[PDB]
Structure 1
Amino acid sequence: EVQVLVLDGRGHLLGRLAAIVAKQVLLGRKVVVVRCEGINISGNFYRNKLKYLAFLRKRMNTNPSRGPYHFRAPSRIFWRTVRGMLPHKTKRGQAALDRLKVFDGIPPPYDKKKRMVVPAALKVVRLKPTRKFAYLGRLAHEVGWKYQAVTATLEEKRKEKAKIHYRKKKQLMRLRKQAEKNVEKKIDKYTEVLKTHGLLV
């Protein structure tokens, strides 16, 4: 689409969400993934940590400063996964990669906006309930990410402010329902039209 697609990374499987995001950005769409510390990986935490430690072991023997750059933030981990699914060594792939933004937590541009969900990448429907999974935030923290605590604190503050906003919205909606109850003699003429054509059961 023409606007930015904001995806909440909580409860989403890494590779599934990354494949969807890669196709979206290749189709010329701006995608912003927030709360990348909430991304889940199937398989138990020790196995996933072993996978990332093997990735850490892969370095250039002659000069590690040139070698593979092992990014420790969950946002950068997800970004590298999407880059793995993109043709990043061509101009088209680099433009597609530039169309993607990743964040830990939800920063101020996007904490006041609705966030989409990709059901085809959700753990609840893609994973059996008996299986074990790992949290990307915990994996990143125990492999070297330094900002798990401050991100948690800022997320708690954001959740408090969102709770206040939601209480205000519920009060407004209650008042709207009361208003619809108050005026119905002057409303039933259009309510019947809406009910006839299927809007507003």
Structure 2
Amino acid sequence: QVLVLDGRGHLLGRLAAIVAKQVLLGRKVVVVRCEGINISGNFYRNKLKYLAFLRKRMNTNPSRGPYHFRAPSRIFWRTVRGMLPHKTKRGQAALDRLKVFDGIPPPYDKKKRMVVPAALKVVRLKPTRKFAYLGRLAHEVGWKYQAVTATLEEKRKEKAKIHYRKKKQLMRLRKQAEKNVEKKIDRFTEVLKTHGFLV
């Protein structure tokens, strides 16, 4: 009943657009590995664009004024917040469904997570165009926890590589098992390829 979307390889606003409408239709969404979101346009371009946003502050009392979140998760949240009617009750309710993470923490680090191919960089950009990793961007504008988020993700990838190896090992045995058994599953296996699987 819940989207989990690996924000890696996606485009910041392009993903946010799609997430907003999901969120407005009552879909609970989770967006994970937000540092891996990447924004079209060469790096420097986007840094300035952020740095400008930093300059925007309520002169008389900055403490009130537009809160510039550094973490890539909160950045991505900010851009999704910009596509909902978030002053309404229904808008605020909508955001409460969305759940964003720098990196990929423990509920979702053992969940299969989708990819919006309509927000994906490999598709939506020309290959000769330039872009920025929202991590780097976040890092240079003051995000504290890049390295921590990297050191925790190397653990995760090592932990996962193990799971995949065991998964592969079952798949392989299952391929062997069928071959071991294929005269006493033969007139089942035949019927599952008259109606068109197994081919």
Question: What's the TM-score, normalizing by structure 2?
Answer: 1.00
Structure 2 counterpart of 1:128: 126
2: CA distance, partners of 1:192 / 1:181: 14
- Aligned CA-pair RMSD: 0.4
Q: How far is the alpha carbon of 1:22 from its aligned partner?
A: 0.2
Cα distance in structure 2, aligned partners of 1:200 and 1:78:
42
Distance (Å, rounded) in 2 between the aligned partners of 1:73 and 1:8: 16
Deviation at 1:199, TM superposition (A): 1.1
User: For each residue in 1:104-145, what CA deviation from the matched residue of structure 2 results, as whole angstroms up to 9, or x when unmatched?
Assistant: 110001000000000000000000000000000010000000
Question: 2: distance between equivalents of 1:183 and 1:128?
Answer: 50
In 2, the alpha carbon distance for the partners of 1:182 and 1:43 equals 55
* 1:52-106 C-alpha deviation (Å, 9 max, x unpaired): 0000000010000000000000000000000001100000000000000000110
CA distance, structure 1, for counterparts of residue 118 and residue 92 of structure 2: 26
1:32 positional shift: 0.1
Instruction: Give the whole-Å Cα distance in 1 for the aligned partners of 2:142 and 2:128.
Output: 29
> 2: CA distance between counterparts of 1:57 and 1:85?
22
State the match for 2:137 in structure 1. Answer: 139
Count, aligned residues: 199
Q: Which runs of 5+ in 1 are unaligned?
A: none
Shift, 1:200, TM fit: 1.2
Counterparts of 1:4 and 1:147 in 2: how far apart (Å)? 27
Give % identity.
98
- How far 1:27 moved relative to its partner? 0.4
Q: 1:186 deviation in Å?
A: 0.6
1:195 aligns with 2:193: yes
Compute the displacement of 1:31 (Å): 0.2
Give 2:52's match in structure 1, choosing from 50, 54, 60.
54
Which digits, 9 at most, give the CA deviation of each residue in 1:20-65, with x for residues without a partner?
0000000001000000000000000000000000000000100000
Question: Which residues in structure 2 correspond to 1:27-176 (within 5 Å)?
Answer: 27-176=25-174
The structure 1 segments of at least 4 consecutive aligned residues displaced by more than 2 Å after TM superposition are none
